[PDB]
Subunit: 201 residues, 4 copies
């Protein structure tokens, strides 16, 4: 068995979804975070010397000496390996698509802040539009716990979960008008393995 | 055989890479573009009524009545189906990763303009850093025409191609200092099927 | 000794307001534009070596021998020099406050494009919201035309420039904003401006 | 009748410069901050219904009964009212031009974060480039301290606020910029400011 190491900053950012997947699947790894105690940047600067990275960016997932970079690609990789990307060519596609939708609004969020005075337009206009998109998708199956794709958990379920979870750390629990989404995020929040990672966090 | 239709605006944007893939593979489709003649927005508004889209956004790829959205997901889908995503679990991963790198700098580019006065920092600092990243990757195999992954064309080769091609429409042919990349983009530019699509464009 | 030279790229961008000002007033200057010839960025490279710019940006306006930089700062300087910035402390602040907001929606506009897929939210949300603000402000002002007081101020041209700019890329409603509509058309008809605009 | 009330969120953001100004001058006002209590955005929702704001943004500063909006416009108004905006036409433009640039690097800072993965380019490219500009400008000015002329202007505080802001999130070099370093520390020591800063 190869040693599994995850390199990133001492934050969620683009790394939390990978951490959730390892938790969901319960696979063990070292969660190496830069700047727990010292200067995150110096560590990162030296890391990029010591480690051979494609794009001088983290997350970096290391199995053995195999070096894997790009969080989305890591998630897709982790998901085939561990059977959470759906059971058909169509359903693999849908999961990918809804994950693509996630990283879009998830980016909009990491682009909203006080200084930019776009916090209300995010809250008032961006989010609800996207919450509605996911809501209408959970309605598409409607075919009972809550899955985006097929009748089994996929990484799109975690990604959606993580999106709203991360938003809920900046801004108010805003999912009243989206009952299916609200149910979906809680259902998955209370899966034993994820629920124990969360409270450990 | 299902009818294949691509919906998008009368531009390259996020749709050009899909158009290149259909060209590379020579598979036939209707290239439906909004606003060739009329108001692109009205068309798009009505399109979103007539068609059931996940995220009220195009590209939309329609096979039969199957509705597929999200350009990156469409490309990954098209690539498994047609054997241009590499011949191993590792190599599928690398292609994904380098495509992830592409949509990052490709986004930076679509975020640079005159008004923002960030055209020189893009040209002077962003691009060369990224050109170097791809350069150093083409050096990793070095294992002869030019491929990013393994010894066969993958969609990462087209994506890189399309990135620089699109940049070369806004800004100057800036690839002198990156001979492998320069070779790679031309090699692929002169593949019969792509070269004929280009000149037809 | 003026003279007067405006350096920018061969485009509108951040220099257009200054051109519209020089138009309105009838100030003659050389409108030097990068890349009327070839690599705009090569001129620009050399310009940065020859002229001494504070932040390495353009527009920069040279009046005889002083290098003036930063477009909003330049337009504030020109508006005080030629009396188009309001006739009281209060009003002048107002003209300033409106220009500040113009910069914001103007930024947002040059931040929407096809690729970002944010065009329709701009057209259905950002633009209409800001057209809403400009409308009320105009209602707040017209008694018995102008944003501030009784005369042309640069807020009137800033706002005109903005909507003019947006109309080169997008359909754009203005019919739900009748007071905004008549404001911009008023400014478009002013002979110095109509002239300039017909000569672009 | 002042009085004087500053409404913002419970943070620095775009109101800090105005606080530093009120500090420097020793103006007393109520620093009303959203969410000292609960949902900041609920106060903000209600504030927008009660007060009449031009663009639905904050900060807004009420002096007796006039609602002043837009922070850069507000700071320009305050700086002319209390003589910290330069003692000639030229210098005042200069103070303006420097503030305009401060807004740009300041924007860029609040545009860098972990997720965007643009922190290191900011730290290795944007910041050092702009620290470079501020340095030369300071060299251009000191003869025998200040950005413009002979006295404190708001450009000095804007620049101080900027680097102060950046130092809450990032290491930040200033040692390669000795004239910039001594400039900000000078301003930090000024008793009105040192006091204020020690009371945050
Ligand atoms: Mg990624
Ligand atoms: Mg996509
Ligand atoms: Mg400016
Ligand atoms: Mg402002």
């Amino acid at each position: 068995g190869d040693n599994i190491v995850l390199y990133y900053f001492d934050a969620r950012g683009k790394a939390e979804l990978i951490r959730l997947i390892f938790a969901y699947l319960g696979i063990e790894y070292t969660d190496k975070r830069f700047g727990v105690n010292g200067d995150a940047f110096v560590e990162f600067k030296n890391f990029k010397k010591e480690k051979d990275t494609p794009f001088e960016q983290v997350p970096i997932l290391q199995i053995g000496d195999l070096i894997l970079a790009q969080s989305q690609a890591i998630v897709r990789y982790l998901s085939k390996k561990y059977n959470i990307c759906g059971e058909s060519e169509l359903n693999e596609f849908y999961a990918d698509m809804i994950f693509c939708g996630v990283q879009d609004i998830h980016y909009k969020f990491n682009n909203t802040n006080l200084f930019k005075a776009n916090e209300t337009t995010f809250l008032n206009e961006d989010l609800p539009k996207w919450s509605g998109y996911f809501e209408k998708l959970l309605k598409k199956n409607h075919t009972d716990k809550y899955y985006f794709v097929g009748n089994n958990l996929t990484y799109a379920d975690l990604a959606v979960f993580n999106l709203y979870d991360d938003i809920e750390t900046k801004y108010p629990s805003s999912l009243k008008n989206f009952p299916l989404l609200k149910a979906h995020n809680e259902f998955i929040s209370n899966l034993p393995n994820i629920k124990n990672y969360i409270t450990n966090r």
